[PDB]
Amino acid sequence: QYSSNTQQGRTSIVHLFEWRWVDIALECERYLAPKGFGGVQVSPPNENVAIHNPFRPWWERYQPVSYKLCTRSGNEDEFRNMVTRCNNVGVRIYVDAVINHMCGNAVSAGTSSTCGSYFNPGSRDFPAVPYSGWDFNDGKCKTGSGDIENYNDATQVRDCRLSGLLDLALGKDYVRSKIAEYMNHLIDIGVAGFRIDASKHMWPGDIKAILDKLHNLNSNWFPEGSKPFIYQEVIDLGGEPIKSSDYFGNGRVTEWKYGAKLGTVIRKWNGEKMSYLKNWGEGWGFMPSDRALVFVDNHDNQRGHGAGGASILTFWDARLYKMAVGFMLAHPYGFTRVMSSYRWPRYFENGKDVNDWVGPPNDNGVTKEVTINPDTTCGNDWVCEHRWRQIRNMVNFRNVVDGQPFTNWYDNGSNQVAFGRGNRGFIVFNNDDWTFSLTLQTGLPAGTYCDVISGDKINGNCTGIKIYVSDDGKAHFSISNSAEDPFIAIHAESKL
Ligand SMILES: [Ca+2]
Numbered sequence: 001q002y003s004s005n006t007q008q009g010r011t012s013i014v015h016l017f018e019w020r021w022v023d024i025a026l027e028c029e030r031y032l033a034p035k036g037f038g039g040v041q042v043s044p045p046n047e048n049v050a051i052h053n054p055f056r057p058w059w060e061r062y063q064p065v066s067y068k069l070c071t072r073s074g075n076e077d078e079f080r081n082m083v084t085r086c087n088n089v090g091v092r093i094y095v096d097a098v099i100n101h102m103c104g105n106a107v108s109a110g111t112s113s114t115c116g117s118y119f120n121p122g123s124r125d126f127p128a129v130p131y132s133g134w135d136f137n138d139g140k141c142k143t144g145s146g147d148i149e150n151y152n153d154a155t156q157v158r159d160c161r162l163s164g165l166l167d168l169a170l171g172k173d174y175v176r177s178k179i180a181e182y183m184n185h186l187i188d189i190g191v192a193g194f195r196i197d198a199s200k201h202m203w204p205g206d207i208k209a210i211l212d213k214l215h216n217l218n219s220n221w222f223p224e225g226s227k228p229f230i231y232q233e234v235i236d237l238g239g240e241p242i243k244s245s246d247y248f249g250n251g252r253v254t255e256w257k258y259g260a261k262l263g264t265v266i267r268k269w270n271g272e273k274m275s276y277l278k279n280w281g282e283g284w285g286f287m288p289s290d291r292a293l294v295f296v297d298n299h300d301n302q303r304g305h306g307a308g309g310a311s312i313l314t315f316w317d318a319r320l321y322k323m324a325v326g327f328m329l330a331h332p333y334g335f336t337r338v339m340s341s342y343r344w345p346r347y348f349e350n351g352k353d354v355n356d357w358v359g360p361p362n363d364n365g366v367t368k369e370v371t372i373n374p375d376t377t378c379g380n381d382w383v384c385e386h387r388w389r390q391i392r393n394m395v396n397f398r399n400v401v402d403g404q405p406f407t408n409w410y411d412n413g414s415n416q417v418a419f420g421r422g423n424r425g426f427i428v429f430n431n432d433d434w435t436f437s438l439t440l441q442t443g444l445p446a447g448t449y450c451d452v453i454s455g456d457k458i459n460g461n462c463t464g465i466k467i468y469v470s471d472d473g474k475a476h477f478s479i480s481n482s483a484e485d486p487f488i489a490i491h492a493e494s495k496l
């Protein structure tokens with residue numbers, strides 16, 4: 001469960017949040033493959049409630065109605081097509097598995113679902129599965145409301161309803177089997193692994209019992225004996241009786257401390273500066289690198305949900321965001337996931353984004369295709385961060401330096417830092433309010449290197465800054481504090 005199962009030389013997953021399957025399939029072929037992306041996390045591919053008040057929010061996808069592969073992202077033929085086409089060019093698909101629960105208990109019975117399946121929350125009836133009242137934790141939960149009231153009580157966090165979401169009885173073999181049946185459907189199609197939604201809300205042992213029933217990965221694409229990559233969503237910033245480490249048996253876990261801390265550092269909030277990153281990783285109290293799934297922002301916390309609060313950096317704070325993502329992708333700690341977002345009409349009112357619920361760009365609820373502009377950005381309000389040159393090139397920097405040790409660290413005692421990854425790459429950051437102008441040891445072979453942040457290597461030349469490493473490995477760097485991207489990255493494959 002710990003191996004990503006990406007092709008060799010590919011080291012990151014991108015969350016193509018709310019994208020349609022036909023658009024992901026094409027994106028695999030025209031961009032993700034040639035740019036060395038390891039894989040794609042997809043939005044939940046199983047039928048959900050169509051919530052019309054408010055109008056088709058992103059979070060309707062976290063309220064299952066069945067395990068039919070029938071969503072606003074597309075139907076089962078399209079899902080299958082996407083997975084095949086992506087695997088065929090060496091790009092993996094990881095599914096957002098929503099397995100803790102079905103829909104909200106107070107949602108109306110009917111066929112308001114992405115595939116038209118009938119369901120009845122009040123009578124606990126999901127006949128497209130099928131599930132009935134026997135399959136939920138109503139009699140196990142010991143709270144008065146039946147919902148989770150107190151996170152200091154680990155038992156109720158598992159057995160009671162998360163904000164009224166009907167809590168599946170994952171202690172029962174029948175439920176475990178229906179869920180395993182769904183995941184095996186996906187595995188056999190070609191899926192390489194899963195993001196396990198709401199993992200904190202499930203017993204580690206129950207997740208174990210589900211994983212036990214799963215196939216090895218599809219043997220046309222994966223070496224026989226391959227197990228799905230598993231990364232479990234657990235928000236653990238400390239102080240709770242439930243801990244990220246409690247889930248290590250099943251796979252990797254999301255390290256939400258990562259982006260929260262990094263956001264604070266890059267904003268220079270709370271007395272924090274980049275020189276303190278010399279011991280980034282377990283030195284900052286994070287989980288082991290070999291279990292961490294790390295990220296600057298995710299789909300929840302980029303809009304003030306889950307955890308991290310105000311320190312979280314997003315495409316909205318583009319300049320600082322690029323630096324944060326670049327530091328992530330250069331640093332050996334964790335397995336890296338890059339967000340890819342859509343622009344929504346963000347509007348604050350006494351501190352809240354009242355449009356934090358808004359779903360993807362749409363025409364009367366039909367998700368818009370992803371168009372690609374002339375300059376290779378996206379239209380139709382798709383932000384496509386993974387296509388920003390500064391991010392895309394840092395995704396390849398992580399590939400090129402894969403396995404190399406953190407070395408040649410430099411800092412000025414403030415916010416001017418640099419470090420290398422063995423002899424394959426070097427990166428330099430200026431987050432101070434004055435210029436960074438200094439000759440530094442890079443660890444690299446002598447040569448002329450393109451800066452992959454300001455530009456690209458194209459057949460014998462560079463479209464941006466050029467860095468000149470001398471025979472002793474030293475090279476001069478000059479980054480103004482008013483630079484739009486106040487960092488520079490070079491590596492073995494950016495060398496002329
Ligand atoms: Ca639960």
Ligand SMILES: [Cl-]
Nearest residue numbers: 195233254298
């Ligand atoms: Cl997540």
